[PDB]
Amino acid sequence: TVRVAINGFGRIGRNVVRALYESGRRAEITVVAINELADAAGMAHLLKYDTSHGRFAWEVRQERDQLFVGDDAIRVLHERSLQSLPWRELGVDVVLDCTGVYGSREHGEAHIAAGAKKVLFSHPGSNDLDATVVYGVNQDQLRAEHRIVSNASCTTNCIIPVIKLLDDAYGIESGTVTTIHSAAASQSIIPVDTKLAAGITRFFPQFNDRFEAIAVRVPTINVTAIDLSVTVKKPVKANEVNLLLQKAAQGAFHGIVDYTELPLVSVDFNHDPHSAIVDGTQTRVSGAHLIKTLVWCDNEWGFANRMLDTTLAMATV
Amino acid sequence: TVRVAINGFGRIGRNVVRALYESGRRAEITVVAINELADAAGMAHLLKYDTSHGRFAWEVRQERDQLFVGDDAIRVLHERSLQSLPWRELGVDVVLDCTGVYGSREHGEAHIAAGAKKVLFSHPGSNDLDATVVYGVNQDQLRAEHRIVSNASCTTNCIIPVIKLLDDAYGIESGTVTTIHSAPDLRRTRAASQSIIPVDTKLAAGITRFFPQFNDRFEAIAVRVPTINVTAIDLSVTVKKPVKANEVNLLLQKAAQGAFHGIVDYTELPLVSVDFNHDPHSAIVDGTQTRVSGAHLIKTLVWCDNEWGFANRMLDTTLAMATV
Amino acid sequence: TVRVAINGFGRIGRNVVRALYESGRRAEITVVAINELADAAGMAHLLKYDTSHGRFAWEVRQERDQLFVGDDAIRVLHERSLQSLPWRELGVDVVLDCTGVYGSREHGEAHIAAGAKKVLFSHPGSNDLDATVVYGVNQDQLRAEHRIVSNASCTTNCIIPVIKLLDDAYGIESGTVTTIHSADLRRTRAASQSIIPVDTKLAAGITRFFPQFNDRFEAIAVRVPTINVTAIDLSVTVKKPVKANEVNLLLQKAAQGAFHGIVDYTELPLVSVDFNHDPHSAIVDGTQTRVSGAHLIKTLVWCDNEWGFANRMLDTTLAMATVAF
Amino acid sequence: TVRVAINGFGRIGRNVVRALYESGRRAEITVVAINELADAAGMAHLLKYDTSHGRFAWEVRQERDQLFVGDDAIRVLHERSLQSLPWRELGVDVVLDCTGVYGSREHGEAHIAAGAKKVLFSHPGSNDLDATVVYGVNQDQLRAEHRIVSNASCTTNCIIPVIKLLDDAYGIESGTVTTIHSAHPDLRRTRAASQSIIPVDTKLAAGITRFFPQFNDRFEAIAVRVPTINVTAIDLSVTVKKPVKANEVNLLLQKAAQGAFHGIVDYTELPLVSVDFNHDPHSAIVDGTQTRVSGAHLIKTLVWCDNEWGFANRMLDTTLAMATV
């Protein structure tokens, strides 16, 4: 068993746990410890009841400083700073840090120092890390040497695969993105800050000063829509683009990217493990060179499963 | 005073009336008749109360074939055919048809035959009508021979002015749009309140019709989200002239003060959709959301009140029609 | 095997099917035919994708005149009137009529005439059917000679069990209810941002089931823009003096005993959506129980207004097909 | 005219200002100072644009140490402590404290010490206070001596008038309330507001018993938050001595609305939804169509209110009474 600890039991941490069990990737990975400065029972409870994904199918309990998913007893810690984490004592192979506060080399080193073999951050974190993984695209680029890695963000993890597929096939010249985020808020469309372009140009440096992004928050549940527009060199038609993407979903990107032409709405992709689901019915091409594609993703669940995918790769290399 | 009749007292019809009074444009134009298939009080009530806005500031009464807004009398009719409309009897200068059912030439002729000097449709309709007016862009192209005219749609009326401004300044090569609307196809039989729902958009067709130079150069998609009243349009265009985000913003800001005052607005304030509720502008450009990818791919987000803006344009166009 | 046909594949009909499979009651019941005046391709699609309940876990297919949940084939019919239904040909033991249009005796007789042994309506029907079953309360009064029966409504099915429990224990003198539903010049308007009064058939339904409460029960209801789960705010005057926690203890005991699987009890800090897809007819929220003086009880009861009811349809169906002489 | 300063420019503070100008109580009250921790420009923005009330009709300019509503020049302070407030310098007749933090009479004394003649809190207060005015019910009990007074809460200000009317006419024996509110302590608090019905704490049970001490151990209350806009619904249930019918109750309340409680309580039988009462200055609007009576003694009444606007106007009403008495 690969044994992981989770630092920070927020939304993403909780989902990683839920995902571990539902995906059955329990067989290959046991969570041994969770750490959040937050009261233990608020965790057990919040793990059991989730606003988007239903009651957790497994039986959850929290007595003492011990969380319980099914028959597993997860030791619950309340450390405030990285050094005093008993990673060594627990034999932690990978620490998934989902705190959202920690993210630099030093934080990584601190985790390793505390006894963890490797670290995986649930966000981009400081630039200079031993690696950055958008699973399904560049997991093959992982080494032994690589011990402090970032898993990108849920939005970058959603759109990067598509941008790659499109760039490889048609040569992207420039791109612009609009992200429609789910959640006064409960009536408006709210313009919000977005880091998604920084994330794209970082992963694809050939796109510096060639990509921009805006984003809005709307009062929907759980699922996010990404509205991607790119200029390409090779002339293309809407259905050719769709055929490319559909093929990718059945081939090289099976399980990571999905494709659909069914008449669906956002909530239908709730609890969908894919990093991205391409909506074929929304694909457009203006002239022969401006491609619009709408990509759905469960902004938490997809990412959560990628955390686990990346973890496995890290522990295996 | 120009006298108008309203055919169809739906959402848009009601707003046109509300707009007439609130805009203060009651001094130039008067509503003499409304023709509806619903009950009469049905109308008075819905005119007084609506969920998009607030209680109508004016006092709304209702008696049988009548309707009262303030001191003004408005003959309420219930005719299922245009032939039998007493437009002649009432001296109607313009009929604003907001039924959403009528829209070809013949329907226009029918209204005129019934005694109306001119007709204005609250939508695109079929192609061959005298002119489609996107007020603030091409109202100067109204001759008096134009008797049956279309007011475009609220979304086309929102984005066309921006597309013109950008094309004039930088030469648009191709474009793509996403419309985020507020609240057959199997998507239609399912809950609005938690989902982003792809819907059919005819915005594409409307743009290329108004700008024929853009055939096979514009596409559009749209989604419906469970927000109130205000619509966001996410426009992306490739241009010839190289540009920077703030140059684009400066252009649009200038237009808002200048040539397009009262039709397009510009803002850099941190606002959300509901802040544009009841805003008379056809379009409000959100400067903070302008982007340029490379030097040639412009993204601009434009807000509009999808009913109020359009409702005021109906009145603006009406005036223009009655004045030429 | 008990073999059922479903007349009307609307919201409730679809859920009955989903419920049959998810609850494993499919070992004991078979849906052999569905009839709806709707596009059969659309039937399959709507069965697979639901706004409340998510993607149906089973594999759904449609082709010509067959729907396919899993490896099962259901005959899809399109008859516009009750007379021409091939119930006899298919050996239907019970017809679950979830059309919401049909509900008289005659409609029942028509179904039986068409070849169905018994009929179960997904609503309270007219006033004089053979039985109304609020399962868990009076299913023991089903005899084998009741062939046209009503399953009450989801709201009545939700609150009746609680009213019984309270009446038995303390003697209800009078009652008033407020129902908060999830999503006439009010229907003609924007449901995404308002509390909307709506008419309710609940006071009718209660006094019908408990005739001793005529002119002693009233009800109002509002619609709010939430998802799927309904809250019932019950207020009753009782004879026996009581305290909040006594009432809670009574109800909690019922939930573990006589009403296990039908009524549930909870003290956990939950919100409506947590009862989404809950099979109980009613879940009592202990934390919201109150008693004013010693005689005015307030209790808040949650229910999944569709799922609970759907599973009760199946429960009642079984009882009807089983009830021996 | 009467001069007022506003301590705390939150939701309520902002609305008081908006109300002053819109209601037309501007020919009777002037705001001279707003003391607030955030910058003069933040203040001005939020005053102009509101999530729940639209664009403020007046022109909101900003300059120097001044806000401007029309040609009226209001002054902005950022005094962190209470003693350093220049109330004396500005000749403040009443301080409306809408901070929600201050509410003890020491706080009151502090304001007065700083130079304010009288103080009015936008909530119940931490108490041992001079008075508690639910305007339209007991403003006549104000005395030149009461210098530190509380304006109750918006919910108490909404339902108290109705409870009085009902008690006077039929003698309330006991009561229970449900409030339907729009949008570490609880585990419910940090959960998605968009889509669930959310049970929460409520102090209405107290506020009522405090105002009507004859109801100790005779009133209880619960409340839920739903994702609607701005307007609040209060679902009141009371037992009464005198036997009554639904329409008698309605007739009583309707009469009150034109008569003794004109401008404070309103009555309607029109088919309306919550948003229709948005920006309604009444403390309470009674929905006749929802009135019920179970037996002859259990009254259910549903009362709407704009939980901010009504209250804000009452703040102004109470202020006037205080400065006048």
Ligand SMILES: *CC(=O)c1ccc[n+]([C@@H]2O[C@H](COP(=O)(O)OP(=O)(O)OC[C@H]3O[C@@H](n4cnc5c(N)ncnc54)[C@H](O)[C@@H]3O)[C@@H](O)[C@H]2O)c1
């Ligand atoms: C934003 C925008 O401009 C937009 C977007 C999509 C579609 N439309 C067009 O708006 C027009 C009507 O909108 P409205 O919501 O006002 O219509 P409604 O749904 O409220 O109903 C119309 C109203 O008229 C009645 N009616 C029907 N037929 C009638 C006749 N013959 N005579 C009198 N009244 C009639 C109907 O019962 C209801 O009361 C459309 O053009 C639409 O395409 C705008």
Ligand SMILES: *CC(=O)c1ccc[n+]([C@@H]2O[C@H](COP(=O)(O)OP(=O)(O)OC[C@H]3O[C@@H](n4cnc5c(N)ncnc54)[C@H](O)[C@@H]3O)[C@@H](O)[C@H]2O)c1
């Ligand atoms: C039901 C009812 O009547 C109701 C509804 C809402 C709120 N209340 C009560 O009124 C008090 C204020 O609540 P509100 O929500 O208006 O406040 P806020 O969160 O909008 O912001 C307060 C405001 O005060 C400023 N402030 C804080 N500390 C300050 C000091 N020391 N000096 C000056 N200003 C200060 C703060 O920055 C913000 O601008 C509550 O009691 C509530 O129960 C009633």
